[PDB]
Structure formats: C-alpha cells, structure tokens
C-alpha cells in the first residue's frame, strides 16, 4: 500500500444523438491494484447491457452502446485501493430529433396580391435550425418572404403573392439528432379583370354585330352576358364565345331592341368582374 488513486485524466461530458454511441475515458494513478467501478446516477453499472466497460493498464472506459433517452445522466468512475479512493464524473446529454408538434395544412388557394402566413410548431433538442423551401429551393429572407423561429414557432409570411408562387412549400427542421419536415401545397390565382372598355359598336338594322371584351386572370371563367336585366344565351339570336382571355357576343339580325348597353360578367374562385359595352344604330 501507499499512494491512493488519483484520476490524472478525467472524462469529458458529451451530448449524444439517440441511436448513436460514445465513450467516456479516464486514467488513474496510484498503488496497484486499483479497483474501478462505474455508476450512472449513482447506480452501479453492471456488464451485459447497454454499457461496456474496459480497464486496460489504468485507462478506464465506458461505452454507451446504443443511446436511448434513459441514458442521460451523470456517469461516475470510482477508483479504490488500500490507500484510498478517487472518483470523477461526466454528464451525458441525449439529443432528440425535431418533431412537428403542429404541422402545416395540406393546401391553400389564395388571390394574387394577397398575403398568407404559415405557422409550424416544432419540438426536440436545441439548437433546431429551421429552413423553408419552395418546390425544393430554399426560400431566402426578404420583404416578400418573412421568416422567424421563436419559442418553438416557425413562421413564413408571404406578401404580394403571384402565380409563380404556386407550388409546394416545406418547413424542414434539423438538429444534431436528425430532421423533420412538414409540407403544403399553395395555389395562387388572379381574379378576372376586364381592363379595356370596348368602344361602342355601330350597326345597321338587319345586320349582325360583334361585341368583345378582353379578359385577364386565371381561367377557367364562368361567363354570362346580360342586357336589360335579362341573361342572353347562345341560340338563334346570339352566338356567345368564351375563350380564356376573350369573351364575345355576336348579335344576329339587329333590330331596335338590340341597341343599348350589354354587360359581360366573368368569375372564378377568387373574384369577378363586369365588362360594359354598347351597340348603337345607324339610320
């Protein structure tokens, strides 16, 4: 007997990802033999489980073979011989991967020029890094795409939405332990607008006359023509064409009753608009 144990190298605290493994290592000096035991949160560590101990020539190791949440805590190496005792300790932290407490809804339809706000709630071990993606491209922070991640809440607010903004939006979180994602589908549609007011169209009695309105927005549209509170329909008097960007009425066999104002109304999911044109008579 004569020199008590002394750990001249102490183990280093570590954080490990669930599923992984790692090793504590220390070195002891003193009169041999020095008995070495380990404890986790004070409980003696026994061979044959998730912990594998080695002691070779005064280097003691403990390997956590497959990290589970249960493994977090203080690991202590005890040394003892006839002269005395030492011990040394390190902490194991266990990192859990991100998990979406609150996911994005599957889809949305929004009108051109509007804003929309996406919100996710994410848990897991810090630091969690959040990035948003549009059709697999990373969204960059800007006046149009405002992002934040505060107190577990990931937010993308988007402004001035346009048709090229339609697509798949993904919020992806990652940390030391893995990653998680939540996606959504956005559709941006333009409302119908008739931006040009048609000049009046002059006709003669017995003639046919064509009236048209140029249309913008996201098709398809529901289109109706009216005059004097009556909806006008295709037949023997009117031939109505509704194309994606041009609506027209062809009025056959003009008589006095055809002269006046005509309204074309167009609508889709995100709005409607009304075009006004007139037919006038000569003689």
- Quote the CA–CA distance of 66 and 62 in Å, as a whole number: 12
Buried residues in 194-222 as b, exposed as e (16+ CB within 10 A): beeebeeeebeeeeebebbbebbbbeebe
Q: Do 1-96 and 97-191 agree at the fold level? A: yes
> 254 vs 166, 168, 238, 262, CA distance in Å?
46, 52, 10, 14
- Quote the CA–CA distance of 138 and 83 in Å, as a whole number: 63
- Quote the CA–CA distance of 131 and 112 in Å, as a whole number: 24
Contacts of residue 195, defined as CB under 8 A and 6 or more positions apart, other chains included, come to 214, 216
The residue among 76, 90, 63, 10 whose CA lies nearest residue 37 is 76
Method: X-ray
Which CATH number does 192-283 carry?
2.60.40.10
> 136 vs 70, 85, 183, 204, 238, CA distance in Å?
36, 59, 11, 60, 50
CA 59, chain centre distance (Å)? 49
- Quote the CA–CA distance of 182 and 154 in Å, as a whole number: 11
To the nearest 10°, report the CA torsion of 152, 93, 52, 43: -120
CB atoms < 10 A from the CB of 109, how many? 13
Q: Which residues pair with 19 in a beta bridge?
A: none
Which CATH number does 1-96 carry?
2.60.40.10
| Domain residue extents for the chain | 1-96, 97-191, 192-283
Residue with tokens 């804003």: 115
- Quote the CA–CA distance of 139 and 159 in Å, as a whole number: 13
Q: What are phi and psi of 256, to 5 degrees?
A: -45, -40
Joined tokens for residue 165: 């903004």
Burial class of residue 144 (count of CB atoms within 10 Å of its CB; 0-12, 13-18, 19+): middle
Bridge-based pairing state of the strands 145-150 and 153-158: antiparallel
Joined tokens for residue 71: 């493994």
DSSP 108-141: EEEETT--EEEEEEEESSSPPEEEEEETTEEPPP
Contacts of residue 60, defined as CB under 8 A and 6 or more positions apart, other chains included, come to 25, 26, 27, 28, 36, 38, 53, 54, 77, 79
- Quote the CA–CA distance of 4 and 29 in Å, as a whole number: 8
Joined tokens for residue 89: 């300790």
Residue count of the chain? 283
Joined tokens for residue 213: 């309105």
DSSP the chain: --PPPEEEE----EEEETT--EEEEEEEESSSPPEEEEEETTEEP-TTSSEEEEEETTEEEEEESS--GGG-EEEEEEEEETTEEEEEEEEEEEEPPPEEEEPPPSEEEEETT--EEEEEEEESSSPPEEEEEETTEEPPPSSSEEEEEETTEEEEEE-S--GGG-EEEEEEEE-SS-EEEEEEEEEEEPPPB--SPPPPEEE-TT--EEEEEE-BSSS--EEEEEETTEEE-SSSSEEEEEETTEEEEEE-S--GGG-EEEEEEEEETTEEEEEEEEEEE--
Superfamily of segment(s) 97-191? Immunoglobulins (2.60.40.10)
The residue among 171, 38, 40 whose CA lies nearest residue 94 is 40
- Quote the CA–CA distance of 39 and 55 in Å, as a whole number: 15
């Amino acid at each position: 007997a004569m020199a008590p144990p002394f750990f001249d190298l102490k183990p280093v605290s570590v954080d490990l990802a669930l599923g992984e493994s790692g090793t504590f290592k220390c070195h002891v000096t003193g009169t041999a033999p020095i008995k070495i035991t380990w404890a986790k949160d004070n409980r003696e560590i026994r061979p044959g489980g998730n912990y594998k101990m080695t002691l070779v020539e005064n280097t003691a190791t403990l390997t956590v073979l497959k990290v589970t949440k249960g493994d977090a805590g203080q690991y202590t190496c005890y040394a003892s011989n006839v002269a005395g005792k030492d011990s040394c300790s390190a902490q194991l932290g266990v990192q859990a991967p991100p998990r979406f407490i609150k996911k994005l809804e599957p889809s949305r339809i929004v009108k051109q020029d509007e804003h929309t706000r996406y919100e996710c709630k994410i848990g897991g071990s810090p630091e969690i890094k959040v990035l948003w993606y549009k059709d697999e491209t990373e969204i960059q922070e800007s006046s149009k795409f405002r992002m934040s991640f505060v107190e577990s809440v990931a937010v993308l607010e988007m402004y001035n939405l346009s048709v090229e903004d339609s697509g798949d939006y993904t919020c992806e979180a990652h940390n030391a332990a893995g990653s998680a994602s939540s996606s959504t589908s956005l559709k941006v549609k333009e409302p119908p607008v008739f931006r040009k007011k048609p000049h009046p169209v002059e006709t003669l009695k017995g003639a046919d006359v064509h009236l048209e309105c140029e249309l913008q927005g996201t098709p398809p549209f529901q289109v109706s023509w009216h005059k004097d509170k009556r909806e006008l329909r295709s037949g023997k008097k009117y031939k109505i064409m509704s194309e994606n960007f041009l609506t027209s009425i062809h009025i056959l066999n003009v008589d006095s009753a055809d002269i006046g104002e005509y309204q074309c109304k167009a609508s889709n999911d995100v709005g409607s608009y009304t075009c006004v044109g007139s037919i006038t008579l000569k003689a």
